Design a protein around this ligand. Structure first.
Ligand SMILES: Oc1c(F)cc(F)cc1-c1cc[nH]n1
Ligand SMILES: Oc1c(F)cc(F)cc1-c1cc[nH]n1
Ligand SMILES: Oc1c(F)cc(F)cc1-c1cc[nH]n1
Ligand code: NI
Length: 341
């Protein structure tokens, strides 16, 4: 059964609620983004209205085969009326097509649902600047002060410089990047661009990237592996055995692999700085774990919430244990007392 934190009270709306069968009284199902834990349950047999971004709608149509008649794409930054209720979609700074949703309830209450997001000061000059938000449904993935990591720009600078140095020293080196979902496309696109290469990948991954429908990505991707010196593989293959196996298939074209595993936060962030990061190495294979996050750091989250000044916060991540729930509630109270309430 559908949990309380996925229902929007005083409406017929749910958010990211496709794995619970027919939800009683739900007239419209919102989907914040195309990640599997959020879309779980959608297929060609779904017959209720789905509201989402254009990019999310492209993925629903082509990857999950949802019928066109049930897909309702909405433009960003635009007041829209859905089943008698004013809504706005805002960029979430997560993966491609990811949104936050502002709901203007009939009773005068205003709700912001962040979906998954990476909070940024630029959100302080969105349509959020205008008015009061009563309730915030918050992506609390990294809601603890130990969760630190660098900016996306700093991580990409490291990856570009590392890859360019390696291939300039050894023109016969291959670069490999791991993936298991949409998001983090900058890692492989930025490396390919500096090396003057397209990114080679499976037909299935090519299809997914096409669905994003953006010319710059299309110009840098191919299914012809032999023509490319940056290859994408499933994240599960980014290990010494998997990479050894892959190098055999390349027909003596390469004699070294440099590989990148984009992760989220890992405990090595507590000790090491991005500039001091070193790889795991075995013979002619090296693997770098790089902390490229598409979720807010603790400090980014705190800044956003202290700016927004919501009356109530409902966490949507780490909700399963009493320890997690208690810890998050203590941070929200600290932030409030500091902020002057
Ligand atoms: O995600 C992107 C990326 F990684 C590289 C790029 F050039 C463009 C995008 C993008 C996202 C939405 N519109 N365009
Ligand atoms: O955390 C808050 C903050 F930083 C500023 C603010 F105005 C309110 C809160 C809050 C916490 C729980 N309910 N409201
Ligand atoms: O363990 C707990 C529990 F069972 C119930 C509860 F409300 C809180 C906790 C907890 C643990 C650490 N901090 N808070
Ligand atoms: Ni996500």
């Amino acid at each position: 059964t559908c949990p309380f934190y996925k229902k929007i009270p005083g409406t017929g709306f749910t958010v990211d609620a496709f794995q619970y069968g027919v939800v009683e009284g739900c007239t419209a199902y919102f989907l914040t983004h195309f990640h599997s834990d959020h879309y779980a349950g959608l297929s060609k047999h779904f017959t209720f209205p789905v509201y989402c971004s254009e990019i999310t709608g492209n993925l629903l149509k082509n990857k999950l085969h949802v019928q066109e008649q049930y897909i309702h794409p909405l433009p960003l930054d635009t007041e829209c009326i859905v089943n008698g209720v004013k809504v706005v979609l805002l960029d979430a700074n997560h993966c491609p097509g990811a949104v936050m949703i502002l709901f203007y309830l009939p009773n005068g209450t205003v709700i912001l649902h962040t979906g998954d997001f990476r909070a940024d000061p630029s959100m302080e000059r969105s349509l959020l600047a205008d008015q009061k938000v009563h309730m915030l449904y918050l992506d609390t993935t990294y809601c603890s002060p130990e969760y630190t990591f660098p900016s996306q720009q700093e991580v990409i600078r490291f990856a570009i410089n590392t890859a360019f140095e390696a291939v300039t020293l050894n023109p016969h080196a291959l670069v490999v990047c791991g993936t298991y979902s949409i998001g983090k496309e900058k890692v492989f696109l930025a490396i390919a661009d500096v090396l003057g290469s397209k990114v080679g990948m499976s037909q299935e991954k090519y299809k997914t990237l096409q669905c994003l429908n953006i010319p710059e990505i299309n110009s840098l991707i191919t299914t012809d592996m032999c023509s490319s010196l940056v290859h994408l593989l499933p994240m599960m293959q980014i290990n010494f055995k998997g990479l050894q196996s892959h190098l055999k298939k390349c027909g003596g074209k390469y004699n070294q692999i440099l590989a990148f595993r984009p992760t989220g936060w890992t405990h090595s962030n507590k000790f090491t700085r991005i500039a001091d990061v070193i790889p795991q190495t075995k013979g002619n294979i090296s693997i770098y774990g790089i902390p490229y996050s598409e979720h807010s750091s603790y400090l980014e989250m705190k800044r956003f919430v202290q700016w927004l000044k919501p009356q109530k916060i409902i966490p949507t991540v780490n909700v399963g244990t009493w320890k997690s729930r208690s810890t998050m509630e203590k941070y929200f109270r600290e932030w409030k007392l500091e902020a002057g309430y």
